[PDB]
Structures are given as structure tokens and as C-alpha cells.
């Protein structure tokens, strides 16, 4: 994935990313943000007053300080009319809104801050730094990035080299599996937790598996992202995994089936200076 590149043009930057090119003014004061992790970053960089629109339909519990910003809909149900009515000077999007890119760029310059699943930390840093550059806050952003590296090192320090993990997403009653370099890859790729299968095929919403597969892998840890919650259905991962196949795995026997908070993992707030920290601690605390 091409990183964000930025050239200083006096009162604006000429900015290039994976989706195209924009002239972005310095210090934009009317920013519509559709990536929840970058919204968390605005908070951490003390830029809350710059924000004028947020996806209130998908606003997590840890981002309720933005509850009174004007809504621009949800991460998937982008309210174009609301965005146009706000007359923003910058729109910030990630992978869920690439399909809306031309429509959004005609309203205002549109910055892409997608996380590269093959290069998580590199893309995270480039996203946070590129926002911080717009406001002259590179120093503060560097010191926060450095804190996150220290959390990563504390986390990696307690990881048991000989235990193995399987990441699953549950949707309806269906299970799908994710591996290294996936949208949840940071468990394997950044935090160094080994995988039951390093060779799982990457593909947005996953690799279809069943409880037999889980038992055959016999993971020490099962990390579960229950997409039922973000979609709103009845069926819990805890119910689907209450079977005697899964019951025999080392993870079930050691109570190391971990239900990760989907508002972080699924909504993918890994761009957040505080929300990424939270995610690292959540893994550390489950495996220490
Ligand atoms: O382009 C994406 N999805 C388009 C198809 C989704 C259609 C539809 N999705 C949702 O209802 C949905 C709602 C909120 C957040 C989501 O990630 C959703 O997939 C479904 O239920 O299958 C996408 C991109 C990056 C990451 C994702 O999770 C995506 O869903
Ligand atoms: Fe999705």
C-alpha cells in the first residue's frame, strides 16, 4: 500500500495517498472523520474542536466525547447530504469508504488513512504522523507513538513462545478464521503470538471453518471477534462455541477463549493513539 506523502506548500500541503492527490489546507477547522481510529487520534492530539462530523451510527463507547458532533451517518451508510451541508475543509476515510471516494472528494479534499494489513505499524505511524503534520504536532505524535512501542515491548515480553493462537470471527452461526497479515493480524504480527496456522488465506470477512477445524488445530488461545454485536443479531459466540469439540481444546480447558471487544477489533480503531494502546493491553492481559 502506497503511504501518505506530503509536500509543504505554504498555507496548504500537497498530499498523495493510495487513492489520489489532494491540496489540504494547514490546520483544517471543519473535519469530517469516518475512520474511528483516526477520530481517537484527534482526541489524543487535542484536536476535538477541529471535528465537525462523525459516524454517530457506529460511535463506540470509548468515543462518546464526540456524541454531539453532527452525524454523517455510519461507516457503511455515509450520509452525503449531511456531509455536504457541513461544508468541511477535510474528509478523512479508511477502507470502508474507498467506494465513496469520488463522491466525497467532490465535496472536499479526502484523505485516506487505511491500515496496511501486511505492514501494520508502518501504516499506523504514517497515518498518525500525517495528521499530526497538518497541525504542526509532529513532536507530540512522535512521543505518543514512542509510548505505543513501549507498550508493545512490555506485551511481547510476556508472550509464551510455545503456545499458539487461533483468531475467529463469528457471524450469524458461522465461524471464520484469520491469520497473520489479516485485519486482526496484529495479534500474530506485532505482538508475536504464534499462530496455529501461519498459512491462513487473507480475505476481508475470512476463511470459513467449523468446530472440527478448531479441535484439529487445538489452539492454546482462541481470540474471538463477535461481529453479531456490531451488526445486532441474537446469537453469541459463547453459545456457538459451547460444543464438545471446542470443549476439548486446550483453550477451552484453560478458559483462554477470549472475547475481544468488537468495537475496537471489528470497527478497526487501530489508528487511534489510545484505542491501539487499549487493544495491546487487552491481548497482553489475556495471555500474561
Ligand atoms: O467494504 C466493506 N464492506 C462492504 C460489504 C459489507 C456489507 C454488510 N456490512 C455491514 O452491514 C457492516 C456494517 C458496519 C460495519 C461493517 O464492517 C459492515 O461490514 C454486510 O453485512 O455484509 C468493508 C471494507 C473493510 C472492512 C470491512 O469490515 C468492510 O465491511
Ligand atoms: Fe465489514
UniProtKB/TrEMBL annotation:
Keyword Transmembrane: no
Species this protein is from: Campylobacter jejuni
PANTHER family tied to this protein: IRON III DICITRATE-BINDING PERIPLASMIC PROTEIN, PETROBACTIN-BINDING PROTEIN YCLQ
Protein name from the UniProt record: Enterochelin ABC transporter substrate-binding protein CeuB
Keyword Transmembrane helix: no
Higher taxonomy: Bacteria, Pseudomonadati, Campylobacterota, Epsilonproteobacteria, Campylobacterales
Fe/B12 periplasmic-binding domain span: 30-288
GO cellular component, one term: outer membrane-bounded periplasmic space
Gene it is expressed from: ceuB
GO biological process, one term: iron coordination entity transport
InterPro entries xrefs: ABC_transptr_periplasmic_BD, Bact_iron-sidero_bind, FatB
Coiled coil: 138-165
Amino acid at each position: 500500500m502506497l503511504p501518505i506523502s506530503m509536500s509543504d506548500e505554504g498555507d496548504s500541503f500537497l498530499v498523495k495517498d493510495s487513492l489520489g492527490e489532494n491540496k489540504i489546507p494547514k490546520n483544517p477547522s471543519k473535519v469530517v472523520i469516518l475512520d474511528l481510529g483516526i477520530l481517537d487520534t484527534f482526541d489524543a492530539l487535542k484536536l476535538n474542536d477541529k471535528v465537525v462530523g462523525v459516524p454517530a451510527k457506529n460511535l463506540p463507547k470509548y468515543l462518546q466525547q464526540f456524541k454531539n458532533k453532527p452525524s454523517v451517518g455510519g461507516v457503511q451508510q455515509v450520509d452525503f447530504e449531511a456531509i455536504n451541508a457541513l461544508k468541511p475543509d477535510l474528509i478523512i476515510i479508511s477502507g470502508r469508504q474507498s467506494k465513496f471516494y469520488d463522491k466525497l472528494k467532490e465535496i472536499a479534499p479526502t484523505l485516506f488513512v487505511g491500515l496496511d494489513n501486511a505492514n501494520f505499524l508502518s501504516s499506523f505511524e504514517n497515518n498518525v504522523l500525517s495528521v499530526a503534520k497538518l497541525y504542526g504536532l509532529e513532536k507530540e505524535a512522535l512521543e505518543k507513538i514512542s509510548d505505543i512501542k513501549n507498550e508493545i515491548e512490555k506485551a511481547k515480553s510476556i508472550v509464551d513462545e510455545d503456545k499458539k493462537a487461533l483468531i475467529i470471527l463469528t457471524n450469524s452461526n458461522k465461524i471464520s478464521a484469520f491469520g497473520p497479515q489479516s485485519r486482526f493480524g496484529i495479534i500474530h504480527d506485532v505482538l508475536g503470538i504464534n499462530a496455529v496456522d501461519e498459512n491462513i488465506k487473507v480475505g476481508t470477512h475470512g476463511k470459513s471453518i467449523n468446530s472440527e477445524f478448531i479441535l484439529e488445530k487445538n489452539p492454546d488461545y482462541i481470540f474471538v471477534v463477535d461481529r453479531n454485536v456490531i451488526l445486532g443479531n441474537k446469537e453469541r459466540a459463547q453459545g456457538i462455541l459451547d460444543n464438545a469439540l471446542v470443549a476439548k481444546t486446550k483453550a477451552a480447558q484453560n478458559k483462554k477463549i477470549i472475547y475481544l471487544d468488537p468495537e475496537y477489533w471489528y470497527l478497526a480503531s487501530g489508528n487511534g493513539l489510545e484505542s491501539l494502546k487499549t487493544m495491546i493491553l487487552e491481548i497482553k492481559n489475556a495471555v500474561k
